[PDB]
Symmetry: C2
Subunit: 99 residues, 2 copies
């Protein structure tokens, strides 16, 4: 797709057998989603940092689908004010900024 | 330009007679810049909100140039961990996400 930016670029993702909404966020290094159950091994990761860090679970090589594009990448699962698709998954779907 | 997302999309902007660096951030509604002096009238704006709000100065209709694109838009001036170009100025330069 071509997504303009007059509104927040919220898209549907498919992951963990669920449909979720998440913000395409070029200001986010990583993808962080709340309330998804992913299988298998994970490792703790500290994110944030201003005022302290938040611990999340890092899952690697997770299959996820974003607007018809099936890709694989790291998903952080943990509390987040809003679900976020970061640059790590945008590179996998071939998402660019253009002007 | 076509900007990939393997690295943070930091661009140079010209504003308030200075060259500054700022992040193209589709997850930010607004543009917030630190240590720029803009002339004329402004009004306070509260931004943020998680744990409390931050007060900044809102300047309207500010001329700013982003990668040689001269546009006009609102600039918030105040403390920010990183300078950010939000969606308000990305729409003015005709920036879209594409995949
Ligand atoms: Na990844
Ligand atoms: Na604006």
């Amino acid at each position: 797709p071509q997504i303009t930016l007059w509104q927040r670029p919220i898209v549907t993702i498919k992951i963990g057998g669920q449909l979720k909404e998440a913000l395409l966020n070029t200001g986010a290094d990583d993808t962080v989603l709340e309330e998804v159950n992913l299988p298998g091994r994970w490792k703790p990761k500290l994110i944030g940092g201003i005022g302290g860090f938040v611990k999340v679970r890092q899952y690697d090589q997770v299959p996820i689908e974003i607007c018809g594009h099936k890709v694989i990448g790291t998903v952080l699962v943990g509390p987040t004010p809003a679900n976020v698709i970061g640059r790590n998954l945008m590179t996998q779907i071939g998402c660019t900024l253009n002007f």
